[PDB]
Amino acid sequence: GHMKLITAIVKPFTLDDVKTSLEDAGVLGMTVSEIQGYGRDFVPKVRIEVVVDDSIVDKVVDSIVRAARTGKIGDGKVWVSPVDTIVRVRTGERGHDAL
Amino acid sequence: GHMKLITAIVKPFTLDDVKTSLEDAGVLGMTVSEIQGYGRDFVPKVRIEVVVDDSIVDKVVDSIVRAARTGKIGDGKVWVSPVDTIVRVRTGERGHDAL
Amino acid sequence: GHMKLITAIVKPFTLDDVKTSLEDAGVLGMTVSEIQGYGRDFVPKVRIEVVVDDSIVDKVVDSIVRAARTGKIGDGKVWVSPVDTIVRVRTGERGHDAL
């Protein structure tokens, strides 16, 4: 309903900076996956995902963008998509309790 | 329209159990990808995805959660997101025919 | 709003053909990830993602399907899902400027 997935495709060396920015803002539950995207033909990148309430989606996106920017080609993209429902596996908590 | 993507981020050793639970319930077409998430700092996890009709989304989510739960930290998350359209590559079947 | 994510799970040897089809049609920004799906039990596949305006989503899906088809089991799936917002990291461009 109010839940959003943020997907960031960014350079691998920006991971610590993005993670720090998320954790400092109390944004928990990030995952990271390997991915290939255009750069200086493909270069290795990382796919960072978090699920957040829409109240913070704008500032979280901006924080990721700021932390991942180098000003060079291949810096990547950040997009937002709807999440209908979310469940925390361990507890069975749903919605905002699962965040 | 009525189509949903289920994404489950779960511990790698739960894969067979989740797969069995899906296949027993006639939920076909699962994919698996490598992913890293918080656990006992990141631990290896797996990303399991299926596309289903919304008629079964709730019970499929619950079946995955039950199969992947250990009661320990890092058990992961399951979320649902909308799918506008789906096409089976081999046949060009769309919508419910592609499920 | 009008933005869509196309996700294609296809056989790895079709990557060049899909990439060529996308680039020839001026569809930029594709990413590729490793994935496992059903085939001749799992076989290696690739996950190809692009973000496009909904004006071209149908023809882009069809172009990917045509390029990835072999007529054999395991050819994969292509699905479409909504994208609320997108930002190009390097520039901070949003929406259609980030495409």
Side-chain angles (χ1 to χ4, degrees), chain A residues 1 3-39 41-99, chain B residues 1 3-39 41-99, chain C residues 1 3-39 41-99:
Chain A
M3 302 305 314
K4 301 294 176 185
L5 177 70
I6 298 169
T7 309
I9 313 304
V10 298
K11 286 164 177 161
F13 57 81
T14 71
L15 178 56
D16 293 341
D17 288 354
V18 172
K19 185 171 181 289
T20 301
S21 292
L22 293 172
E23 288 173 350
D24 284 353
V27 180
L28 297 171
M30 79 157 282
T31 60
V32 195
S33 313
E34 310 286 11
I35 194 162
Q36 300 169 27
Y38 289 93
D41 190 55
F42 297 146
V43 296
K45 297 189 192 189
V46 295
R47 180 203 202 91
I48 297 168
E49 289 163 310
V50 289
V51 178
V52 297
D53 183 75
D54 63 6
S55 63
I56 64 170
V57 73
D58 283 352
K59 69 176 146 291
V60 176
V61 166
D62 291 349
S63 76
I64 297 167
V65 169
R66 286 195 328 272
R69 180 174 289 146
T70 72
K72 296 170 76 181
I73 202 75
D75 271 3
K77 62 179 90 181
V78 184
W79 81 83
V80 178
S81 56
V83 168
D84 293 342
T85 55
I86 184 156
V87 185
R88 195 192 306 278
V89 173
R90 183 180 64 86
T91 56
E93 283 166 307
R94 301 175 179 272
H96 82 270
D97 296 319
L99 284 175
Chain B
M3 302 305 314
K4 301 294 176 185
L5 177 70
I6 298 169
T7 309
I9 313 304
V10 298
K11 286 164 177 161
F13 57 81
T14 71
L15 178 56
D16 293 341
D17 288 354
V18 172
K19 185 171 181 289
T20 301
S21 292
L22 293 172
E23 288 173 350
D24 284 353
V27 180
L28 297 171
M30 79 157 282
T31 60
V32 195
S33 313
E34 310 286 11
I35 194 162
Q36 300 169 27
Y38 289 93
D41 190 55
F42 297 146
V43 296
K45 297 189 192 189
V46 295
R47 180 203 202 91
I48 297 168
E49 289 163 310
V50 289
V51 178
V52 297
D53 183 75
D54 63 6
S55 63
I56 64 170
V57 73
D58 283 352
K59 69 176 146 291
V60 176
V61 166
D62 291 349
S63 76
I64 297 167
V65 169
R66 286 195 328 272
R69 180 174 289 146
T70 72
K72 296 170 76 181
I73 202 75
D75 271 3
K77 62 179 90 181
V78 184
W79 81 83
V80 178
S81 56
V83 168
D84 293 342
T85 55
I86 184 156
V87 185
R88 195 192 306 278
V89 173
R90 183 180 64 86
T91 56
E93 283 166 307
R94 301 175 179 272
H96 82 270
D97 296 319
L99 284 175
Chain C
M3 302 305 314
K4 301 294 176 185
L5 177 70
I6 298 169
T7 309
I9 313 304
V10 298
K11 286 164 177 161
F13 57 81
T14 71
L15 178 56
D16 293 341
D17 288 354
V18 172
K19 185 171 181 289
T20 301
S21 292
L22 293 172
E23 288 173 350
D24 284 353
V27 180
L28 297 171
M30 79 157 282
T31 60
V32 195
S33 313
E34 310 286 11
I35 194 162
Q36 300 169 27
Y38 289 93
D41 190 55
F42 297 146
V43 296
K45 297 189 192 189
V46 295
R47 180 203 202 91
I48 297 168
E49 289 163 310
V50 289
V51 178
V52 297
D53 183 75
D54 63 6
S55 63
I56 64 170
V57 73
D58 283 352
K59 69 176 146 291
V60 176
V61 166
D62 291 349
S63 76
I64 297 167
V65 169
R66 286 195 328 272
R69 180 174 289 146
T70 72
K72 296 170 76 181
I73 202 75
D75 271 3
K77 62 179 90 181
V78 184
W79 81 83
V80 178
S81 56
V83 168
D84 293 342
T85 55
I86 184 156
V87 185
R88 195 192 306 278
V89 173
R90 183 180 64 86
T91 56
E93 283 166 307
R94 301 175 179 272
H96 82 270
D97 296 319
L99 284 175

